[PDB]
Design a protein around this nucleic acid. Structure first.
Lengths: 52, 120, 252, 231, 68
RNA sequence: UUGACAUUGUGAAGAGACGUUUCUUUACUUAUUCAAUGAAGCGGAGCUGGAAUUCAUUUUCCACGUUCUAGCAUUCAAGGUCCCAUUCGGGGCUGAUCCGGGUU
RNA sequence: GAUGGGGAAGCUCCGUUUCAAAGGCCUGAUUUUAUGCAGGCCACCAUCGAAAGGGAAUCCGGUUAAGAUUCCGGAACCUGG
């Protein structure tokens, strides 16, 4: 692999070698969904803070 | 008073480390070049089958120091004989000497330079 | 006579453990501020067979609190735990299967595995396929919890000692007859040079106390004082009794 | 500004790699560092007996400053000095009069254990400074006791290094003057008065008490708390 | 001389001062290496008496042996 | 294996030997012993907050960053505040309370 | 199987990250200089032990009394620069 052009050992996506398309597709989603639900996980416990 | 170590590891402090500025010299006189040119190359080899290499392969054949090497041999050949060199092969003969096949570049004819040196 | 077989073992040699294929060794996390005060969440990345040890291991990985990197420990896997599972460790971790809690933080009744003998030793008790220890009660006269060990014995250790909720995995491996010598062969091949076993009674006197002959037989009680000297301890060692029982429970 | 952002970080258990902090409290120091630290401590825990406990009674910053300012007036001869005299002294006297009394009587500090002990024994010492930190202590433990028998005023002073500088050396152990210029018996006695009170009258009482005990933070606290919450 | 009092103090190995001294010192020597260089003689009156002098080329080593 | 003596030190209860002193359970920690860790978060006290007493006070208790998810977590930390005339670079103090240097 | 060490009268025995102050990698400063230094991370870490284990890269033709994936001819590839 040291005698080979870079195009031979990657693809054009987040995580070229490394991971496998369906695994970055899962990967992004899981990121977005959780970071969203964070905000909520956060705002929701700030509501029930005032309620006290 | 204190000081901040952000590592819980204590290291050996990096410290001066002078340099030897002797006082009396190791040797009295530095050895002359062991293994110079007259010592690299010791003898032609002139068996009939080496001779054929001269006549037909543009190769000079030499017994050569056991301690030599393809660099050191090429250099000596290049200077004792004022010729250019294509590659050197070597082997250690079974009598314990080292023989060197030195092929000359095509600007030279080994047979010519063979009998300049003065064998045939 | 001659140095007997059971004495030759101390010298290692031909008798050391066969360990090439073993995974790493199996341990809790080293006990840190994370675990001493809160919890720390790892995932179980893979679960894996370890040569010589029925009972599978869990390779579970945690973030490093003081450096940017990942840290993989090798737990013993606990039945029900499963790749992708989160594993919570420490004082505040909640009572689920697979987590590791200080004994002092679980209620009486709780059953745990791979439990420490002294806090921080990283796991000593109930580790083999199928085993576990039961917490029987607590005593904050110095931080102690009293437990039941798989052997029957009760033992009181520090409520700071940690266990992992659940039982060790690997079922009732012993419930299946071995069937043929070859299975024992392969069995001991990943463990150590302890198999087959020649009876002393089939050896000559030089070789063993059982030894002499003309008919095979022990010729003296096979029941040895604990204070007997090595060379002499073959048989039933400080046997407080001997013979068939049908026993049925232990120490309670 | 509206472009930069305030992204606080969470540093609790379970997130954010903990930030560099100060761990001097926790370093695995080199073994000689520990030994000199534990030695001090081992020596603190454990009843220290009266005669070793005499020390640690230093001499206050001001009385010491006073006593050095006087002692500093009596430097021994320097190298250059004695050379110069030895040529003046010898070249003339050894071909002229007064038995090398071709130089005035000197007044110097008097130092060196053997020397200074005998001065004390011979009731020839006017005041004596014993360092608090001679090791081995046996070199110096008999001194206050000796001085007590002999009448000799004495102060355990701080700095073996400092009595050094007082005689043009690295360290000096003792130092004690005997003679003294008459423009000076005044200060001398004023020192000896305050000193003697502190360090000499108190002898018979000091010699009756032990040192040591002391628990070190943690233990001292859990006996602090043990007896405080539970009383 | 300081020495005549060293010489005599040292003879009271069961006195309060010396038990203290002995207890603290033996701890120290145990934490150092079985053989190690000593900076100064622990015992000046003694070194001396056995022929040591305080001068370049005289050396003191401290050593531990197993006992029994 | 069992006893004595040595290593061996400091406080008490008692029963005991005629205020010291030797005897059966015991407090101490520095000797000795055992375990771990790249000696990281020990010990004491406090900011904050909620209840309490007390017939008002300091008189204490209690709380004080992570649990739907097989993500992500590093560049003395962004922020704030100071300094250098500050061109770009740095630095200090907070962020991250204090105080013992007993690694636990 | 050396080493800080611990045993042993001693030949030496034990131990190998071990109760040890156990390094060296980048490059700025400085351009008095290619160089001392100013940054800084990372290090429980000798070495020996495989011609059947792991592993960078070569082929066909021709040639000698006896050598050849090694010479010749031709055609390649790897590694460091």
């Amino acid at each position: 692999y040291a005698t080979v052009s870079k195009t031979h050992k990657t693809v054009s996506r987040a995580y070229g070698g490394s991971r496998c398309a369906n695994c970055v597709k899962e990967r992004i989603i899981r990121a977005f969904l959780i970071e969203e639900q964070k905000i909520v996980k956060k705002v929701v416990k700030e509501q029930t803070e005032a309620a006290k | 008073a204190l000081k901040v170590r952000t590592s819980a590891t204590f290291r050996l402090p990096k410290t001066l480390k002078l340099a030897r500025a002797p006082k009396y010299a190791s040797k009295a006189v530095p050895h002359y070049n062991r293994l110079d040119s007259y010592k690299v190359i010791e003898q032609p080899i002139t068996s009939e089958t080496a001779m054929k290499k001269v006549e037909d392969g543009n190769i000079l054949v030499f017994q050569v120091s056991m301690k030599a090497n393809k660099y050191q041999i090429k250099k000596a050949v290049k200077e004792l004989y004022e010729v250019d060199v294509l590659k050197v092969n070597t082997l250690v003969r079974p009598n314990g000497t080292k023989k060197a096949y030195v092929r000359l570049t095509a600007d030279y004819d080994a047979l010519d330079i063979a009998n300049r040196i003065g064998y045939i | 006579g001659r140095v007997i077989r059971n004495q030759r073992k101390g010298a290692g040699s031909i008798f050391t453990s066969h360990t090439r294929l073993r995974q790493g060794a199996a341990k809790l996390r080293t006990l840190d501020y994370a675990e001493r005060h809160g919890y720390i969440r790892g995932i179980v990345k893979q679960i894996v067979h370890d040569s010589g040890r029925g009972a599978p291991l869990a390779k579970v990985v945690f973030r490093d609190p003081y450096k940017y990197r990942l840290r993989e420990e090798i737990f013993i896997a606990n039945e029900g735990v499963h790749t992708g599972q989160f594993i919570y460790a420490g004082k505040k971790a909640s009572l689920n299967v697979g987590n590791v809690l200080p004994l002092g933080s679980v209620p009486e009744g709780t059953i745990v595995s791979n439990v420490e003998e002294k806090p921080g030793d990283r796991g000593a008790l109930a580790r083999a396929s199928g085993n576990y220890v039961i917490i029987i009660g607590h005593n904050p006269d110095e931080n102690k919890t009293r437990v039941r060990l798989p052997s029957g014995a009760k033992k009181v250790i520090s409520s700071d000692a940690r266990g992992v909720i659940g039982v060790i995995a690997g079922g009732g491996r012993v419930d299946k007859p071995l069937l043929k010598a070859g299975r024992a062969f392969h069995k001991y091949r990943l463990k150590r040079n302890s198999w087959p076993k020649t009876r002393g009674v089939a050896m000559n006197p030089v070789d063993h106390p059982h030894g002499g002959g003309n008919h095979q037989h022990i010729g003296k009680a096979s029941t040895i004082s604990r204070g007997a000297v090595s060379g002499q301890k073959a048989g039933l060692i400080a046997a407080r009794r001997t013979g068939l029982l049908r026993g049925s429970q232990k120490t309670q | 500004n509206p472009l930069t952002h305030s992204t606080p970080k969470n540093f609790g258990i379970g997130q954010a790699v903990q930030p560099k902090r100060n761990l001097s409290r926790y370093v695995k120091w080199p073994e000689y560092v520990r030994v000199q630290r534990q030695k001090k401590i081992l020596s603190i825990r454990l009843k220290v007996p009266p005669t070793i406990a005499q020390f640690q009674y230093t001499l206050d910053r001001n009385t010491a400053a006073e006593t050095f300012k006087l002692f500093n007036k009596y430097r021994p001869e320097t190298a250059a000095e004695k050379k110069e005299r030895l040529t003046k002294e010898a070249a003339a006297v050894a071909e002229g009069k007064s038995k090398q009394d071709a130089s005035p009587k000197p007044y110097a500090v008097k130092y060196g254990l053997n020397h200074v002990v005998a001065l004390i024994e011979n009731k020839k010492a006017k005041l004596v400074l014993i360092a608090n930190d001679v090791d081995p202590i046996e070199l110096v433990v008999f001194l206050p006791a000796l001085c007590k028998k002999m009448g000799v005023p004495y102060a355990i002073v701080k700095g073996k290094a400092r009595l050094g500088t007082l005689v043009n050396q690295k360290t000096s152990a003792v130092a004690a003057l005997t003679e003294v210029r008459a423009e000076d018996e005044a200060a001398l006695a004023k020192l000896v008065s305050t000193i003697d009170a502190n360090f000499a009258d108190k002898y018979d009482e000091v010699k009756k008490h032990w040192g040591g005990g002391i628990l070190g933070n943690k233990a001292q606290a859990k006996m602090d708390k043990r007896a405080k919450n539970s009383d | 001389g300081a020495y005549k009092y060293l010489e005599e103090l040292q003879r009271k190995k069961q006195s309060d001062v010396l038990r203290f001294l002995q207890r603290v010192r033996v701890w120290e020597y145990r934490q150092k290496n079985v053989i190690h260089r000593a900076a100064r003689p622990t015992r000046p009156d003694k070194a001396r008496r056995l022929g040591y002098k305080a001068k370049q080329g005289f050396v003191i080593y401290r050593v531990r042996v197993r006992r029994g």
